């Protein structure tokens, strides 16, 4: 009783391999699954309020260095000093600034103006940008309440409101200056339940936060996550301090990798992105902007100073990032260098990039730096750069670099196949994937590196245009409704599908108190009606009564159009006619089509009954009930 | 030729279980390994050092 095994062993142990190969796949997917980007938002100096604005600004090689702000309460005359070495002075007067830093909408978030006054500007900017980023992703923020999504933010203290505080404004000073409240306020107003951590790691904070978020998504702690950074200056102390170090260029413009680089220039901004696991993003039907593959972070270590960099650490972090991403040094095509513009950092960074990337290259790679266009955004720098690269993948065009005449002579440019980017280039799809790299090295010593890849190709689906479609727009205030209507009218002036925008507006958007709807059949009529819209109502619901009238509301050919376009009404009319068929000698459907006589009252009264019943049925269909 | 196939199949596909069970243990230890403490230091009020 031991010979009946030959077939059973094979049948049993085929399942062994088939089943336990899945575990081997799962270990790889848990160690190195790619992350998907499903939404971005940002604002930067130069009037930028959306990623499209940033792409437009970059594509036409326009800088945005401006004058000092005068509305923040600074003392311009005493601070500004062309003399380099006068006590308590700065020898620069340029830079990038957000002239709308103080603007905020307190009523939208249910915050009294007295609270808003004591609130730090970074909290307000983070709130607004987070809401904008969530709206961009096409996910309803209201329905997002109660889930387990997480937030990660990068910011540093600035000493806002460090002077005397009046008792009237006293009450929310402590809660409006702290750092944990930056994520606490978002998790409070949105009702989230995932981890909320704020990380301060000098100028490389934001990417580090992103890195942390990725790890959480791999651990299963959270399903949704959003990461970003923010920086706005409240006091000019940094300007004076770095002026005493003679590290700021007199012009205030950062000439990255140029032969005439002599300093840097500070700036401000804020950026936020939303991250997802690739499989979950495919399952939920979102759209993929780009894919983050791998990342790494380490420390400068023992160097020639507390602030001096080290090339070996940068080389090591680049190799670690490439190994984690599972790629090769010859696969990337463009790297967004740090490009701070110092007389020391640029040669070291160029030498490191030559050492690691500029080897065995069949085709030379390119590099650029957004800092030449905007400046040093500090904690909000890296995220901004990331956004730029994403746009470069979507528009299939290499952006140019500004403020370059000759490459710096402190390095040997012949050591590798790497060359600067001074003119726009075409970056089309060619079968092989397109990849990019992002770098950021902080003052404290930490360094980061990120690898981005184009979104997977997808096929489009053709749809037929509907004859007549509604357009519903909702907001929280009347002025916001007017702004929404104006923006929609501006959008519809282009070449877009009315059905597409109507479906997106009805499905990918929230619902609020103030409401306004229009009906359209063509784009021109739609925009005309939207511009002419002046009526809206914030009514309060009560109880609904369905009044059924008497007689005198008849005309031959009532439902011939409705039977021809409304399926539920047509089916109800047909079913009612079939029910009434045995005890009648006509066809009610043909009677209402235009083949009936009003004289036959035995057809008249049932006609009114049937049209009333069908009108009730179609009302039920839309989702309202008596 | 192929008559002694039972022994071949058994010894071929025993290795699959033997090693892929180790793979399963590897994923379990990757997602749930304990972390040990080897050193501490503290300074608290009351003369504690």
């Amino acid at each position: 009783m031991a010979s009946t095994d030959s077939e059973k062993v094979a049948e049993y142990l085929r399942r062994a391999t088939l089943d336990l190969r899945a575990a081997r796949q799962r270990i790889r997917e848990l160690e190195g699954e790619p992350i998907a980007i499903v939404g971005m938002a940002c604002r930067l100096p130069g009037g930028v309020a959306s990623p499209e604005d940033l792409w437009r600004l970059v594509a036409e090689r326009v800088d945005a260095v401006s004058e000092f702000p005068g509305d923040r309460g600074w003392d311009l005359d005493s601070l500004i000093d062309p003399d380099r070495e006068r006590a308590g002075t700065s020898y620069v007067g340029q830079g990038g600034f957000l002239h709308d830093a103080g603007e905020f909408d307190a009523g939208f978030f249910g915050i009294s103006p007295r609270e808003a006054v004591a609130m730090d500007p970074q909290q307000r900017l983070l709130l607004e940008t987070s809401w904008e980023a969530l709206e961009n992703a096409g996910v309803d923020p209201i329905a997002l309440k109660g889930t387990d999504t997480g937030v990660f933010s990068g910011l540093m203290g600035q000493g806002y409101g460090s002077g005397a505080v009046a008792p009237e404004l006293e009450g929310f000073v402590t809660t409006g200056v702290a750092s944990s409240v930056a994520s606490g306020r978002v998790s409070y107003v949105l009702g989230l339940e995932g981890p909320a951590v704020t990380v301060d790691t000098a100028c490389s904070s934001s990417l580090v936060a992103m890195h942390l978020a990725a790890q959480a998504l791999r651990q299963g702690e959270c399903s949704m996550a959003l990461a970003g950074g923010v920086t706005v200056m409240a006091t000019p102390g940094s300007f004076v301090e770095f002026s005493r170090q003679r590290a700021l260029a007199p012009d205030g413009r950062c000439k990255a990798f140029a032969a005439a680089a002599d300093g840097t220039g500070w700036s401000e901004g804020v950026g936020v992105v939303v991250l997802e696991r690739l499989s979950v993003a495919r399952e939920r039907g979102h759209r993929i902007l780009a894919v983050l593959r791998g990342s790494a972070v380490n420390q400068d270590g023992a160097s020639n100073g507390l602030t001096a960099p080290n090339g070996l650490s940068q080389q090591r972090v680049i190799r670690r990032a490439l190994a984690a991403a599972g790629l090769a040094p010859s696969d990337v095509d463009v790297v967004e260098a740090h490009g701070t513009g110092t007389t020391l950092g640029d040669p070291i960074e160029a030498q490191a990039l030559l050492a690691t990337y500029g080897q065995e290259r069949k085709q030379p790679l390119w590099l650029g730096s957004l800092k030449s266009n905007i400046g040093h955004a500090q904690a909000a720098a890296g995220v901004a750069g990331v956004i730029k690269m994403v746009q470069a993948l979507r528009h299939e065009t290499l952006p140019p670099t500004l403020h370059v005449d000759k490459p710096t002579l402190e390095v040997d440019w012949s050591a590798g196949a790497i060359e600067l980017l001074t003119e726009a280039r075409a970056w089309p799809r060619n079968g092989r994937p397109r990849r990019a790299g992002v770098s950021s090295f902080g003052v404290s010593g930490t360094n980061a590196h990120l690898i981005l890849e184009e979104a997977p190709a997808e096929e489009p689906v053709a749809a037929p245009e509907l004859p007549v479609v509604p357009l519903v727009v909702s907001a929280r205030s009347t002025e916001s409704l007017s702004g929404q209507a104006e923006r929609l009218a501006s959008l519809l002036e282009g070449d877009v599908s009315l059905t597409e925008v109507a479906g997106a507006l009805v499905s990918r958007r929230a619902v609020l108190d103030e409401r306004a709807v229009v009906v359209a059949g063509s784009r021109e009529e739609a925009v005309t009606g939207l511009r002419a819209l002046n009526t809206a109502g914030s009514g309060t619901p009560g109880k609904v009564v369905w009044v059924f009238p008497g007689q005198g509301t008849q005309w031959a050919g009532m439902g011939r159009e409705l039977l021809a376009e409304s399926p539920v009404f047509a089916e109800r009319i047909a079913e009612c006619a079939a029910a009434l068929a045995p005890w009648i000698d006509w066809s009610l459907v043909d009677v209402l089509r235009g083949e009936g006589d009003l004289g036959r009252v035995d057809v008249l009264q049932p006609a009114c009954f049937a049209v009333m019943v069908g009108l009730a049925a179609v009302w039920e269909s839309v989702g309202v009930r008596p | 030729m192929a008559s002694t196939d039972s022994e071949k199949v058994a010894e071929y596909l025993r290795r699959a279980t033997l090693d892929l069970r180790a793979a399963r243990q590897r994923i379990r230890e990757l997602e749930g390994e304990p972390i040990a403490i080897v050193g501490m230091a503290c300074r608290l009020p009351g003369g504690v050092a």
Partner: antibody, heavy 118, light 114 residues
Framework: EVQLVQSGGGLVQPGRSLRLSCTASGFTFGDYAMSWVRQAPGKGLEWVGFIRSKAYGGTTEYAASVKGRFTISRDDSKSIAYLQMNSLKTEDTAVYYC?????????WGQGTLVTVSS | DVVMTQSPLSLPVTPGEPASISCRSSQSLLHSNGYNYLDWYLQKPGQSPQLLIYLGSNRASGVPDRFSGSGSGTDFTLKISRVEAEDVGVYYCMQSLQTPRLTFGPGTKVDIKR
């Protein structure tokens, strides 16, 4: 992705015949064996029959209690398993499942209810 | 010479605690090649059956990792580290040394302790 769908149920009168079909997809159907099992209402499970694969002769085996009345056929070209209910009785009213594999019951279908009552 | 296997009829279980089910036999199932021939099947109410464990101490895919099996010779044991609400059903300990298998046996019921 490994999947299989059962069909061919309903209510039948004693005396005549019926057939049950199972369509498989997502894997190489020409290799695995297919078996049929049945569960009576408010009872357990007991094996009904199975059919071997082509590589092992493509033979069949049926339960002793109901032997000599049922036939199981396979269509590797269309990857469909057919069971032929013949001369049903009142005791045959039950829920039938089709399962991949002869000895190791790996994957199971959605089942199909068959009622025989005069 | 037909091997007969028996298990406790019913065992109420409180969620959050480990549970164990034993399965004996009338003859050792160990073979010359060195494999025990035992399988564990789970049948949820109003659902099709499902495979849990084959060859004594091997767990199939899809099954949550909290299940485990052990034993040898004539005695085997299924152990679950923590019981949830979805684990209510029927469990069957079915041999494979002797073929064909006429029936799956009476099995064991699982419910909520009260």
């Amino acid at each position: 992705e490994v999947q299989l769908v059962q069909s061919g149920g309903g209510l039948v009168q004693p005396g005549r015949s019926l057939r049950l079909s199972c369509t498989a997809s997502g894997f190489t159907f020409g290799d695995y064996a297919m078996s049929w099992v049945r569960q009576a209402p408010g009872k357990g499970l007991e094996w009904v029959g199975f059919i071997r694969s082509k590589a092992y002769g493509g033979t069949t085996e049926y339960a002793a209690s109901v032997k000599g009345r049922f036939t199981i056929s396979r269509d590797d070209s269309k990857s469909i398993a057919y069971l032929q209910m013949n001369s049903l009785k009142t005791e045959d009213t039950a829920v039938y499942y089709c399962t991949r594999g002869g000895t190791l019951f790996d994957y199971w279908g959605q089942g199909t209810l068959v009622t025989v009552s005069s | 010479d037909v091997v007969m296997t028996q298990s406790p009829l019913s065992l109420p279980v409180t969620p959050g605690e480990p549970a164990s089910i034993s399965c004996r036999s009338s003859q050792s199932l160990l073979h010359s090649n060195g494999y025990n021939y035992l399988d564990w099947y789970l049948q949820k109410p109003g659902q099709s059956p499902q495979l849990l464990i084959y060859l004594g101490s091997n767990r199939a895919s899809g099954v949550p990792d909290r299940f485990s099996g052990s034993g040898s010779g004539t005695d085997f044991t299924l152990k679950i580290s923590r019981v949830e609400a979805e684990d209510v059903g029927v469990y069957y300990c079915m041999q494979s040394l002797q073929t064909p298998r006429l029936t799956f046996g009476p099995g064991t019921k699982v419910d909520i302790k009260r």
